Write a protein that binds this DNA or RNA. Structure first.
Ligand SMILES: [Zn+2]
Ligand SMILES: [Zn+2]
Ligand SMILES: [Zn+2]
Ligand SMILES: [Zn+2]
Ligand SMILES: [Zn+2]
Lengths: 49, 49, 48, 276, 101, 248, 48, 148, 98, 94
RNA sequence: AAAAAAAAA
């Protein structure tokens, strides 16, 4: 399969994620399933992660 | 393409390597064809990896 | 002897085809002296 | 005039050759499978003929001295013309190249092939090309003469009509190679595919003697250019003035001496001579 | 002093072009940057399966990169997307023939 | 660790930038892998990078530049040198003998163990003293145009081996457009066919059966063209002295 | 030194030699060859 | 993130993105068409040339819209750089002095050339030969010195 | 030339099979002498001398092979080399004085 | 040391031969110089208009004139069509 | 939890 003709613009399906509670899990709600979580925060040293 | 170039450089074009990495002879082999074609553990281990 | 007879009968017939005597893995000993080792020069000239 | 493109780009590309086999070997780029004897007898006609009168012209390499010629112009297949990086014109007698390379900018081997074709060899100065596969007619000499005066400057045109094979000896390496690669599988008046190879040396004692004499006159020309003209005249021994000059100069007094050639004809930083 | 004005310019230029703190080695040195992804995309599209005669110069290298293919398999399978990621983007070091990624 | 390259090859600049690759190519003569030294050129129009082509062993034994492969003293192609100056070094050229000879020479040179102008002077001495019923003169019948318009070939007698073809073509192109010219050197015969019969007529009127080309006397007549067979040498000398008799 | 003809513009030369950036993925360029062993260095006298 | 999120995990782009995303879509379609160009006609290396062209153009487009005329906000511009709508290192070279017309980053990487040089395209005309058809092997430009 | 190719191939094959048998070298050099190939015969004798340097029979054969063809200067070089290599062999000295 | 300066400053006696490099073509010895010196001399002999010093302002108008010789680079805020950006890839009027 | 071992105009 060529990347350009077959996968490049195709919107992907929904990944396996859990319905995080907004109130109970408010500490991780906005960043839990990011690729490298907290990468642009003061919680890590920098992009080298 | 690397394994395909190796197969074709050794003049073993009567072996088809398909896109799921199965090496099959395209025709009935003579004894000399079989003897020249027997590949090794490096080729076959790389092909299965 | 058969091939030589056919060759001399075709050469006198006008047709001339040379055949590849150069088998792989083997040397042509007629192109040049094989593994030349010329005699060392002594106190006597040998040019003539 | 500017160089004219010969073929539109729509015709020429990088296409796979005819399917003369069952599977395409992509390393060697050859149609494997099937018979091997049929390929050996499968010559084909060329895809175009160059003509210098209507197609040669100015290009980028013409303004650049010390360039190389265009091989794809000689076959009449160069599809860009003025914007080609190599020369588009017949070589002269002054277009002299080094022995390492031919006139087309290709490396030049140490020996020929089995079929005596290709680039050439720097182990033998060859200005003579074999032109075989000529349909036998009565006016082979005329058509060979015109179609090879098209491609440069000839010195000998041996033709053997009884079986119809020609030997053409040009005057230059560049013109010989240009005529060889320009007429490769090119058509004659009759619809045939010519066999223009390099030519094996003739066993005719005369031809051998004159090719030898060409070798020694070329060496003599280079030596006479390298040596001082005073040395050439003083050694040459045809002018009586040169002889008596030789006596008086290689006397240094001591009548009847006649100094050795290793001292009299010696070039060095200090030396004992007029030098130069 | 106008006589010694070309001398001053050429001396200052020579001194800077030899002892400037950007040429410690003789050349201005930079940090190796990232190409567009479309460069690698075009290269891999162009070479295809190596079946054109245009890429005959690229065949020895390509078959020689066979030797480092195990290491590429490791890095690829190591950086696989986890189930909660619809997609992941990775930095790749790619060969300019398209032989190795 | 440095190539033996003549100033003809090293491009222009006294300050040259050179690349080095160990085992970068095989020698063109002895076919053994050697260190390649490739430099730039006098133009950024084709990046060929004129390089060495023969190894220092083959450079030293045959005494030639590595790039252009011509002589260091005289600047001859190396076969011209070894065939005219003669002897010096024939050198084997076969399959296994080639690398055998190169291997032994390099082994000798690495282990320490080991008069061109004299032979040039001797070559000069061999070359300086070296040496390689008559028919009536051509009258009116040899150049008058007959009633037949198909008579087109100009038969020329007396062309020697010292006469090249280009002088003939250039001397006859001023008369008209030459369709063809064929010369048999074994017969000393020439057939000149013109694309224009008018140009052939003008050439016939201008030359009038006689020509002096490069000191060579030639007789020119009108004839139908013919192929030339294995003609005898006695009749070749007959035809030569006929061409000489064209110039009394 | 002296050369094929004469000298033209400048004699002394300054040469910058750098190794060539070879492809890391290239295999060996050239096949190795089977050549017979050379002749020995010349034998000494037999001092018996 | 510059990767692809399905439908609802996509955050909205910043303000003012429509008026420039028309031209950004033009550049993306030009890049796709450059992916689709035949290569059988031009030489082998020249096939890489259009990509860098569009890349430079795309990057330079964004550069003007933040720096010469202040037409996009800093939020939008930093978003454009982060999601690969403009080359950040190329723009960082453009902001320096003597590099304002830089073709691409591979033409100043002196550690990847033979004799430790920039390419010949980084040389001014006035020192190169007159009527010289210079066209660099990396991107195919004809001159990148800021004077030219 | 084809016959000489056959004979050279056979002789060199037997040289390669058993280089320590002197009859192979002797027959090859004798046959090349009978073809009036003197450079090739000298080469075969010199290579045999490489394999067997202190062999008196081989030395005498090469000297006599070059004496039968009136190559006196060649043979005197050979005899100097022979009595230099083998100074305590009385036969070589006797042959040189004779 | 081989003495001081007396045996360095004298000629060897006798005349030379009426009848030492290392390379065939000449003599080559290694040396160490600064790479900037080599680059400066290479640019002096290599660049056209070498020598012939000119002040800054005439360089400015010759560069401006050669800019006018080149076609227009473009507006660079126009993505496609007439007036688009080509930048360094602009051809030359010849 | 492959090889022996299935022949050189
Ligand atoms: Zn060599
Ligand atoms: Zn040279
Ligand atoms: Zn550039
Ligand atoms: Zn660039
Ligand atoms: Zn560049």
């Amino acid at each position: 399969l060529s990347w350009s003709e077959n996968i490049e613009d195709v919107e992907p399906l929904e990944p396996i994620q859990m319905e995080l509670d907004e109130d109970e899990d408010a500490a991780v709600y906005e960043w839990f399933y990011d690729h490298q979580p907290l990468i642009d925060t003061p919680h890590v040293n920098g992009p080298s992660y | 393409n690397m394994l395909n170039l190796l197969i074709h450089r050794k003049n073993l074009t009567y072996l088809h390597l398909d896109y799921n990495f199965n090496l099959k002879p395209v025709k009935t082999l003579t004894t000399k064809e079989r003897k020249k074609s027997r590949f090794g553990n490096a080729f076959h281990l790389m092909r299965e990896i | 002897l058969a091939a030589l007879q056919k060759r001399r009968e075709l050469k006198t017939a006008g047709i001339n085809i040379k055949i590849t005597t150069r088998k792989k893995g083997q040397m042509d000993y007629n192109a040049d002296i094989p593994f030349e080792k010329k005699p060392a020069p002594g106190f006597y000239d040998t040019t003539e | 005039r500017p160089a004219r493109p010969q073929i539109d780009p729509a015709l020429v590309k990088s296409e796979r050759p005819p399917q003369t086999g069952t599977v395409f070997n992509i390393w060697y780029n050859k149609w494997s499978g099937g018979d091997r004897e049929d390929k050996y007898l499968s010559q084909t006609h060329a895809k175009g003929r160059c003509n210098i009168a209507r197609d040669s012209g100015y290009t980028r390499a013409d303004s650049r001295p010390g360039s190389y010629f265009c091989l794809y112009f000689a076959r009449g297949i160069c599809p860009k013309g003025q914007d080609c990086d190599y020369l588009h014109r017949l070589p002269t007698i002054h277009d002299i190249f080094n022995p390492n390379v031919d006139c087309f900018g290709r490396d030049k081997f140490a020996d020929y092939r089995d079929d005596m074709g290709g680039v050439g060899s720097f182990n033998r100065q060859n200005r003579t090309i074999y032109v075989g596969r000529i349909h036998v007619t009565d006016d082979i000499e005329e058509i060979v003469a015109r179609h090879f005066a098209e491609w440069g400057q000839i010195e000998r045109i041996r033709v053997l009509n009884n079986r119809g094979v020609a030997f053409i000896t040009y005057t230059n390496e560049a013109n010989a190679q240009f005529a060889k690669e320009a007429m490769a599988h090119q058509s004659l008046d009759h619809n045939e595919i010519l066999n223009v190879r390099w030519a094996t040396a003739d066993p005719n004692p005369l031809a051998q003697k004159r090719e030898q004499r060409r070798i020694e006159e070329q060496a003599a020309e280079a030596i006479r250019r390298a040596l001082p003209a005073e040395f050439v005249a003083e050694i040459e021994g045809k002018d009586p003035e040169a002889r008596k000059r030789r006596k008086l100069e290689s006397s240094y007094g001591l009548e009847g001496y006649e100094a050795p050639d290793a001292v009299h004809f010696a070039r060095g930083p200090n030396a004992v001579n007029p030098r130069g | 002093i106008a006589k010694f004005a070309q001398k001053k310019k050429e001396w200052l230029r020579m001194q800077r072009n030899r002892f400037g703190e950007k040429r410690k080695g003789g050349f201005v040195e930079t940090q190796k940057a990232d190409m567009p992804p479309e460069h690698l995309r075009k290269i891999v599209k162009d070479i295809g399966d190596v079946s054109q005669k245009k890429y005959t110069s690229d065949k020895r290298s390509y078959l020689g990169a066979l030797k480092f293919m195990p290491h590429a398999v490791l890095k690829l399978l190591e950086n696989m997307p986890m189930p909660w990621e619809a997609a992941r983007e990775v930095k790749v070091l790619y060969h300019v023939n398209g032989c190795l990624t | 660790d440095f190539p033996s390259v003549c100033e003809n090859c090293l491009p222009e600049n006294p300050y040259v930038k050179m690349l080095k690759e160990d085992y970068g190519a095989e020698c063109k003569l002895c076919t053994r892998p050697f260190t390649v030294f490739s430099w730039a050129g006098d133009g950024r129009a084709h990046g060929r990078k004129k390089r060495t082509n023969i190894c220092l062993t083959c450079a030293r034994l045959k005494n030639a530049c590595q790039c252009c492969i011509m002589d260091l003293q005289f600047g001859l192609p190396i076969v011209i040198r070894d065939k005219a100056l003669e002897l010096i070094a024939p050198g084997p050229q076969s399959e296994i003998n080639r690398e055998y000879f190169a291997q032994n020479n390099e082994r000798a040179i690495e282990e320490g163990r080991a008069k061109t102008d004299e032979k040039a002077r001797e070559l000069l001495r061999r070359l300086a003293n070296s040496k390689p019923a008559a028919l009536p003169p051509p009258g009116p019948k040899d150049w008058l145009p007959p009633a037949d318009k198909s008579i087109m070939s100009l038969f020329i007698t007396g062309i020697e081996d010292d006469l090249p073809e280009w002088k003939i073509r250039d001397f006859f192109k001023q008369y008209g457009k030459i369709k063809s010219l064929v010369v048999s050197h074994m017969t000393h015969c020439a057939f000149v066919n013109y694309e224009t019969r008018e140009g052939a007529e003008k050439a016939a009127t201008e030359l009038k059966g006689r020509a002096v080309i490069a000191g060579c006397p030639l007789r020119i007549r009108w004839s139908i063209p013919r192929p030339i067979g294995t003609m005898n040498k006695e009749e070749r000398a007959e035809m030569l002295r006929d061409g000489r008799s064209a110039f009394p | 030194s002296a050369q094929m003809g004469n000298n033209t513009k400048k004699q002394e030369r300054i040469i910058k030699i750098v190794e060539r950036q070879r492809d890391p993925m290239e295999p060996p360029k050239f096949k190795h060859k089977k050549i017979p062993r050379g002749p020995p260095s010349p034998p000494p006298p037999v001092m018996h | 993130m510059p990767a692809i999120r399905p439908a609802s995990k996509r955050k909205p782009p910043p303000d003012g993105f429509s008026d420039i995303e028309e031209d950004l879509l033009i550049f993306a379609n030009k890049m796709k068409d450059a992916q689709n160009t035949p290569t059988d006609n031009i030489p082998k290396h020249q096939a890489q040339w259009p990509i860098f062209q569009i890349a430079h153009q795309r990057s330079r487009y964004v550069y003007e819209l933040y720096y010469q005329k202040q037409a996009i906000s800093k939020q939008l511009y930093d978003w454009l750089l982060k999601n690969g709508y403009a080359d950040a290192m190329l723009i960082a070279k453009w902001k320096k002095q003597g590099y304002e017309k830089l073709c691409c980053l591979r033409c100043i990487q002196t550690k990847e050339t033979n004799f430790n040089s920039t390419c010949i395209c980084r040389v001014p005309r006035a020192q190169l030969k007159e009527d010289q058809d210079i066209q660099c092997v990396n991107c195919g430009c004809r001159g990148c010195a800021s004077t030219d | 030339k084809e016959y000489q190719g056959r004979k050279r191939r056979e002789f060199e094959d037997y040289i390669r099979r058993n280089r320590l048998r002197l009859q192979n070298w002797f027959q090859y050099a004798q046959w090349e002498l009978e073809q009036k190939e003197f450079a090739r015969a000298r080469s075969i004798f010199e290579r045999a001398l490489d394999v067997h340097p202190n062999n008196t029979q081989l030395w005498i054969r090469y000297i006599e092979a070059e004496l039968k063809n009136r190559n006196i200067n060649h043979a005197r070089n050979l005899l100097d080399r022979a009595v230099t290599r083998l100074p305590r062999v009385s036969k070589l000295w006797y042959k040189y004085v004779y | 040391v081989p003495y001081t300066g007396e045996n360095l400053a004298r000629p060897s006696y006798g005349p030379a031969n009426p009848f030492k490099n290392n390379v065939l073509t000449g003599h080559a010895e290694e040396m160490y110089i600064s790479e900037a010196t080599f680059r400066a001399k290479h640019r002096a002999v290599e660049a056209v208009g070498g020598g012939v010093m000119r002040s800054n302002r005439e360089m400015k108008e010759v560069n401006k004139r050669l800019r006018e010789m080149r076609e227009d680079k473009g507006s660079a805020t126009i993505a496609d069509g007439e007036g688009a950006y080509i930048g360094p890839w602009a051809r030359y009027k010849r």
